[PDB]
Design a protein around this ligand. Structure first.
Ligand SMILES: [Mg+2]
Ligand SMILES: [Zn+2]
Length: 255
RNA sequence: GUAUGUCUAAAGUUAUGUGCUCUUAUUUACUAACAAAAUCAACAUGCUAUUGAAC
């Protein structure tokens, strides 16, 4: 269990990356922390860091302080504070979902405040209106450094990495669109896994490409739109009816 | 007073059907919104004319 050990320091303070982003203009703007005077070159890059849940999970100050929220940088695999962290260093579980069950309507599991509307990009923290449990997984070609790979092989990779990060309802890979969809049991695991897998590679140490994995752009993990598949739509309607019927019990017993 | 407007880099895909070396501006020089109402300082000291072949 993660409860059996103190949390590992993922990255040392001296090993942390610089705050100045890669140059895309002629002058660095000290206010905005971004380059001005021109805009050329891509801003995406592969994360140097990746979470290793069985290795890095452990107790922190947050477990003793009665903390609710998870560590954003633990998910990113780059937390500097390790066991001195105020935030929880483990994959979310039903105990902690239960502890989050009040705040979850307006907050992320990382304690970030949700928005009314999704970004046009469908990236970011997500909407307090929707209660979405599904991640879109794009940029898969860049996440493999453009290595040719069979579709079932890609699906097996996505199955491995995302299943470390929570209980899962469904994974599907679409070959024509070259994108994956991962649905979790709890929205907190979708929130967590999005930040854990954003900008990562799908490559292995076993791959021939592993020694240049940093060169491209990583995984592009976003919120999913509603599934247009009619089978999925009627499944969604069935679970909506079931949720409604389960809620009638509470309203009746309370009044 | 050196106009101004639109475009695009996006994202891969949102699930169904280093050499050499010229140069006394040898520059493709560019802008006109700006101003236009120009005359003091004139001028030398005494005015001119020219040629047809032949019966
Ligand atoms: Mg004008
Ligand atoms: Zn931390």
């Amino acid at each position: 269990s993660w409860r059996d050990k103190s949390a590992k320091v993922q990255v040392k303070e001296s090993e942390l990356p610089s705050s100045i982003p890669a140059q895309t203009g002629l002058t660095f703007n000290i206010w905005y922390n971004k380059w001005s005077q021109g805009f050329a070159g891509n801003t995406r890059f592969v994360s140097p860091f990746a979470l290793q849940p069985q290795l890095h999970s452990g107790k922190t100050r947050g477990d003793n302080d009665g903390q609710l929220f998870f560590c954003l940088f633990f998910a990113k695999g780059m937390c500097c504070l390790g066991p001195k962290c105020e935030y929880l260093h483990h994959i979310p579980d039903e105990e902690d979902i239960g502890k989050l069950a009040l705040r979850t309507e307006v907050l992320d599991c990382f304690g970030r405040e949700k928005f009314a509307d999704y970004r046009e990009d469908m990236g970011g923290i997500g909407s307090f209106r929707k209660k979405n449990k599904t991640l879109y997984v794009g940029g898969i070609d860049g996440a493999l450094n453009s290595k040719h790979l069979k579709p079932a092989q890609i699906e097996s990779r996505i199955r491995f990495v995302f299943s470390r990060l929570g209980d899962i309802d469904r994974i599907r890979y679409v070959e024509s669109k070259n994108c994956g969809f991962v649905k979790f049991k709890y929205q907190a695991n979708a929130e967590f896994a999005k930040e854990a897998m954003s900008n990562q590679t799908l490559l292995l140490p076993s791959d021939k490409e592993w020694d240049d994995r940093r060169e491209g752009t990583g995984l592009l993990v976003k919120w999913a739109n509603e599934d247009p598949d009619p089978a999925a739509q009627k499944r969604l309607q069935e679970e909506l009816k079931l949720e409604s019927l389960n809620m009638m019990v509470h309203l009746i017993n309370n009044n």
